[PDB]
Design a protein around this ligand. Structure first.
Ligand code: COA
Ligand code: COA
Ligand code: DNO
Ligand code: DNO
Ligand code: DNO
Ligand code: DNO
Ligand code: NA
Lengths: 389, 389, 389, 389
């Protein structure tokens, strides 16, 4: 009754790199028209555009609408952004599906977008500062990366999950090296070409087409990996080697009923059989995908062994190992083309990002059942099982 | 089948006034706690918390989650923020309603929360400013009050509507006084008492309890209303006097299934019979609730004259006068207790604000079928039909 | 040799008080015009204007020249600013004297000006801030009041002196109340009228003439002084009450040779007989007036007992007391009309402010020998000896 | 009477180049240490340090004292900063001479230092902006390079001069290419080695020694110069190419009486025979060197033709050409090793920069009589005459 006709995503850019000066809605616009032409559906035929996005400060009114309008979606349609942190990009898609499961809409474009590069610094200033220094706050760190309850970085909560799971620095780096190698191989073997839609970075002094993930490091090695020093805990295990990076990107999916796609002669990349969102202790948020995926499975009624393919977002090596280690699913079907550690973590769009990677892989290998999950700041997690046709 | 067990709202604060230094989430929490108590539900029974919010920069990760946590809702539950501008507060309810209607949740706390006082200035400084002056941007205006396509204020889109609907300065001034006087009377007669849950402005040097909409000016003389000068157009028709204002606040409703409240023995404030959101020409965004209301009525099978009461958000005196004249609903049953012009307009919370006013004035005079509606920047409208039982 | 033909100062404004929005060069222009008028000297005759000023950030190119031009000093004259911290306004007078002594000028206007209220906050943003909070620095605090070697406020140097000289909280408070009561008495008797030139603060809703020192506290009590909390150390003895304030103002002197004043028939306020500047340990900068005053006295050929009047700037009660204790001059001849604790301390203008007060009191009482001296952040003192003609 | 015992300057760094993150006082301390070492004079013998500096915002209290203390000049000596714009570094040397002439000091280190790269952006925020964007002001542009009376850049004053003296774009471009080619030749030949002291930029990942002027363009062509667009007036003649640059550096001279140098057995770089400063119209400030140089020559009792070598600072080709035209000195003796168009223009330092270049070239070629002169924003010139011992 509710399928995903098509999907697509920009490449993931590196912090202050290829998209260092590109507003999120511009990446979003690209993804909106991309899915449109991939589904063979017109813009005027879109109901609503649902775009998760964690860091909008200063981009102007409702970037979801900015995105929709640039993309070519008519004013007659509606649009909005939503925030479940790095669970936004995927939640948005479950949100999109309900709209149609309720009869409120027929066709929805949903995903997420983020320009971590463009996130400004800010200060509350209306009162005036009679005297003394004041703080210009990094909205990226403050609003995206810092736990509002304990005051420390997500990274720290990985330190807590790690310590909790007795996960060694070596096993973490061990996971980190794999992700880079998997992601590297896939990229050079064009396993990303399908899902990536090139983005044209406009420039007075020449234009540049970006159609590849510039954050994947070629020839990652265990040896060079262990040379790095702790990033968060001065005597901790987490490093800029086994932690996800800061990135820019966008991704999305076209949503219509299964009877709707049929008329259009469209062959959907999957059907949503369920999803779930669950809460855990913020100190150890990285564990959230456990209850998340374990509810999704219970709803779809699937068994952890029945899953063919899974994409479990790689915020931190520590939390990934722990997630997999507990759910006990086949390691060789997890992040087949690499994970966020390598591809990047554009928070807002990560949920739609890994979604694409998931779907376009289920197709090229003939996978039927899958699952895409993510952990969330504040102690949450989002799930969704996909059932190819 | 989907009802609003209870609903509460803080008094609307004035700009830099009552809640000048109070974080939106602190405001939200009050509301969340209140709804639970007013219904009789316990915070631990809460599935998810949904809070619209347009201006959260620098408030830290997912202030929605922050609201639920401070309010008592355990780490088990989920929470998120969403953004549909001034329709955020009402949209959120339609969202929460959907979580249940899709059999995804059991109990939802939905509403909006806003601190336009605590909105900061920002700049993107990552790349650095090589040479020359730059602007620190007021997020409240940039992200909340300015059109992203034309670059002018919502006050100018109202100018557009006033000229295209030919509404004179006198006419608009008339509606402004009318809404003010109604606000002045409805308040003194304690008609706002039920909906308002007092907020405790914690102070190191003197604690303060606020439970009265302070933005309402007493004795609104039509004379001084025609003395002010245009605030947007150097010779326009819109002024501070006939335009809505900057305000703080949080407002919300508890949502469960009609069958759910049945067991709890709760006397419902009403059942949601439909809702809708439609886009209109950006330049004239004010005309949003016009097709948004016909849509919701169309869905509900109700005729405009069948309405027993109406809350049309007063963004401006022009858009207001325009919405009524076209929809042709009895002007006597619209904003019986006043409107945004006099009460205040907490962008993200406004949708719930008026929603609350709707449900309590319905119970007081004994209405069965009403409707709340708001216009949304970028050119959209949101509407929802409420049936008491 | 070189005489002071005339002098003038503005009243001293309180922090963000009377001159809250008045650029320093506007205050300076009024004092330049006053010295000229008082001496019967035309602006066209001025060779150079030299104005000490510690915090000119944002005021534009060379405020000394802006003030001179505003006063009608011809484009063919020159002007410059300089900075020896609180010593600036007196050092400028010494530098002006030297222009005449070496034959490079005939007529100099010299003193200082300062708008502590108008000093901005700042940040170096050229290299960009890739990630993480950064401070907006209060230039008043950072460039005016913080020791660059130890990183603590001048107030902390005040505590160092109090500890070293064993100066009790009670002794410091008595000194402070005494300063206030002397300043209040002098103000009431009219003793600041001769020195002050009124300043017209321009305004759309009326101009305001300022001609009284607004910082002086009328009816200051020892009880309220004693109840103040320490402002720089939890276990300290320096407070808001016994420290000087943050203030705006300007002050100057018109100089020329003694022979020149005779040809003009001017009766000068005094002959510059000697000056000196010497360094001390930054940790006890408040002791600077000791070696500087001794050196100046040595250069003049005077004993301490030879002095008839002294202005020793009151940066803090603690240092003012150390200085008086070490020099041993009769306290009854020092700051006889009160000092900076009562009158204010606009940094760059202070040394010329106290020179004004000294000069006009010498004239009033017929004192023959005077000395002005100030302490200087980073460990210096400056002193000047003046003899009546 | 007063001689320059020794001198030194840092290489001049490009805007945001080698010294992008080096506070001016660090450059200053290296040049102070250098003049001491070059003269055989110990830091403990220094009486005062005087350093021109136009842009010290955010550097902390009195950077002049910071430089001196860092170079080991004792706490008992004194130090101060001054500002006569581009004239500062040369004026400080005349001021330092005057300390010795009046018998108030024996040993002075004087010059200037400037970090245009480190100059911050600022805003006055004590009052408090209620609502809306505000400007962060580039202190370098506002306080260093904008005329205070006319509101336009020094570059516009150059256009004013180009029109009044009828200087074609082609003439200004030829001048600029010649400055570069002369500077490139001198650099390659080693003629800046003597004057330059190397500066060590401290880096966590490696110290870098800077001993070459990095702004000098190697192989500058007329074709590329001719292709540049006017930088200040769309129909003007002044460009990035024929204007001086924005730069960082410091430079100084060690001063003492001729009798003192003899006792020490020092062979001085020169005797200071005269100096002068004079004002002109701000609109044509680049002409200041004309009356200043003429006044200095009169004071020296020298004819223009008596000069053997000239350094006339190249603020802009237009003004440098006008200066040369009006004075009529042989252009073959002016800026023989290139000027500021090629070498850079670290404003507060520039006057002592060109003094250094002058002294070492006089020494090498055996020139008896030299003159250094600079133009000054706001309408001023400064010049100094030097004779070999
Ligand atoms: C001491 C200092 C930090 C205080 O500044 P501040 O943060 O504004 O604190 P205030 O000046 O507002 O004083 C605070 C309180 O003490 C009071 N107070 C000050 N003097 C008082 C007196 N003589 N009697 C009674 N109360 C007094 C205020 O009225 C005030 O009351 P409030 O808080 O209810 O309004 C500041 O003035 C300063 O730094 N002075 C020294 C500056 C300097 O070093 N210059 C160069 C010298 S080297
Ligand atoms: C003129 C000025 C505004 C330009 O600086 P800017 O805004 O940073 O721009 P640039 O310096 O990079 O110059 C721009 C271009 O010309 C080039 N250029 C400069 N000199 C050149 C030359 N001699 N030949 C060929 N190209 C040259 C650049 O490489 C550049 O090309 P790009 O933009 O594609 O990279 C600035 O240097 C200035 O204000 N100078 C005057 C300073 C002053 O007034 N001092 C005191 C005077 S009293
Ligand atoms: O007035 C605005 C327009 O109606 C819309 O922007 C348009 O329909 C779409 O963007 C598609 O071109
Ligand atoms: O108290 C010590 C300082 O002098 C300042 O008061 C402090 O640094 C400000 O509160 C913020 O800069
Ligand atoms: O866990 C309970 C059930 O087995 C599942 O919800 C099932 O898969 C669906 O009802 C669809 O068949
Ligand atoms: O072969 C010639 C050179 O490469 C020159 O540098 C070039 O022609 C000019 O600089 C163009 O402006
Ligand atoms: Na001076």
């Amino acid at each position: 009754s509710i399928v995903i006709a098509s999907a697509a995503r920009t490449a993931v850019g590196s912090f202050n790199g290829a998209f260092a000066n590109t507003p999120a809605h511009e990446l979003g616009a690209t993804v909106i028209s991309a899915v449109l032409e991939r589904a063979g559906v017109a813009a005027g035929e879109v109901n609503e555009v649902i775009l998760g996005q964690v860091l909008p400060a200063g981009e102007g009114q409702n970037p979801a609408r900015q995105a929709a309008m640039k993309a070519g979606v008519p004013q007659e349609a509606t649009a909005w952004g939503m925030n479940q942190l790095c669970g936004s990009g995927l939640r948005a898609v479950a949100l999109g599906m309900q709209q149609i499961a309720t009869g409120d809409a027929s066709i929805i474009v949903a995903g997420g977008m983020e320009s971590m590069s463009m996130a400004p610094h800010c200060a509350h200033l209306r009162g005036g500062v009679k005297m003394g220094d004041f703080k210009m706050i990094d909205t990226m760190i403050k609003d995206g990366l810092t736990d509002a309850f304990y005051g420390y970085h997500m990274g720290t909560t990985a330190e807590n999950v790690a310590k909790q799971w007795q996960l060694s620095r070596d096993e973490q780096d061990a996971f980190a090296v794999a992700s880079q190698n998997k992601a590297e191989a896939a990229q050079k073997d064009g396993r990303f070409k399908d899902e990536i839609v090139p983005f044209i970075v406009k420039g007075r002094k020449g234009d540049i087409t970006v159609d590849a993930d510039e954050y994947i490091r070629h020839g990652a090695t265990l040896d060079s990996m262990a040379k790095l020093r702790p990033a968060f805990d001065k005597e901790g295990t987490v490093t800029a080697g086994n932690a996800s990076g800061l990135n820019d990107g966008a991704a999305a999916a076209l949503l219509m009923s299964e009877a709707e796609a049929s008329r259009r002669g469209i062959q959907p990349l999957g059907r949503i059989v369920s999803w779930a969102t669950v809460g855990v202790d913020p100190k150890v948020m990285g564990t959230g995908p456990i209850p998340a995926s374990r509810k999704a499975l219970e709803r779809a009624g699937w068994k952890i062994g029945d899953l063919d393919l899974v994409e479990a977002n790689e915020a931190f090596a520590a939390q990934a190992c722990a997630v997999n280690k507990d759910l006990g699913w086949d390691p060789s079907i997890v992040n087949v083309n690499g994970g966020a550690i390598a591809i990047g973590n554009p928070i807002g769009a990560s949920g739609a990002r890994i979604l694409n990677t998931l779907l376009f892989e289920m197709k090229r290998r003939g996978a039927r059942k899958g699952l895409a999950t993510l952990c969330i700041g504040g102690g949450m997690g989002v799930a969704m099982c996909i059932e190819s046709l």
